């Protein structure tokens, strides 16, 4: 055939891939974390948006830290050979490097490590997208008028 | 004939800059997710993903500013934070 370029990810596998949405709205009272009013609007918008991009969307609601880790582990052990990519959306409280389960924190590195090139071989070489709606600390941006 | 880094081919689309709060509207959803979904709907058949996310950065930065009765929290702004370890361009369409 003619000249070939390899500058873009192959996105014409039989499936676009999974889109896992973790929607944490209500937190255990003992944590003191506030309920995240509006997050259901986000979760519905994401489900529809990624549906129209032909992702297999799985919505999860109000997961403990243990459930988040087990979910990510199990998903990373699926056979993604026929999938072009992987998407995970995290909607929760957070601080720098951390997202909250309903009962306590999860290191973001623990979640993403399951999908490392050596640990999820059926996603090696494929784009792994993590979309994170969560705080990263407590600083406020005062802005500047233009 | 070679290895790739185990950290290659990840993209982290953070709603806010390191160290910062992220803003969520109780009626409309979060500023970032509102904007991300709007830009994907408009541009996923047209633009490479980093350029989509740059439009999201612009929309969040330009179009949102919070209102609060608390002077500490009033009139603040947000910039999302695109963290790319990707090694290729990403288009959601093909062929």
């Amino acid at each position: 055939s003619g000249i070939s370029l390899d500058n873009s990810y192959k996105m014409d596998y039989p499936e676009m891939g999974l889109c896992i949405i973790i929607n944490n709205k209500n937190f255990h009272k003992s944590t003191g974390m506030t309920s995240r009013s509006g997050t259901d609007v986000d979760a519905a918008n994401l489900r529809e948006t990624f549906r129209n991009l032909k992702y297999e969307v799985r919505n999860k609601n109000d997961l403990t830290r243990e459930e988040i880790v087990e979910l990510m582990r199990d998903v990373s052990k699926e056979d993604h050979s026929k999938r072009s990519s992987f998407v995970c959306v995290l909607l929760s409280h957070g601080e720098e490097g951390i997202i909250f389960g309903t009962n306590g924190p999860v290191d973001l590195k623990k979640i993403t490590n399951f999908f490392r090139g050596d640990r999820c071989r059926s996603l090696t070489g494929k784009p792994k997208l993590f979309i994170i709606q969560a705080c990263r600390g407590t600083e406020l941006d005062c802005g500047i008028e233009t | 004939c070679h290895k790739i880094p185990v950290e290659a081919d990840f993209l982290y689309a953070y709603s806010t800059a390191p160290g910062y709060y992220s803003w969520r509207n109780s009626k409309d959803g979060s500023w970032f997710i509102q904007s991300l979904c709007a830009m994907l709907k408009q541009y996923a058949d047209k633009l490479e993903f980093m350029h989509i996310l740059t439009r999201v950065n612009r929309k969040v930065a330009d179009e949102f500013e919070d209102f609060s009765f608390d002077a500490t929290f009033h009139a603040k702004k947000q910039i999302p934070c695109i963290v790319s370890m990707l090694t290729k361009e990403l288009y959601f369409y093909h062929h």
Binding site: T34, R36, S37, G38, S92, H93, G94, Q133, A134, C135 | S15, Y21, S22, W23, R24, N25, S26, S30, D66, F67, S68, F73
Partner: peptide, 4 residues
Amino acid sequence: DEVD
């Protein structure tokens, strides 16, 4: 408007 709320913070996360």
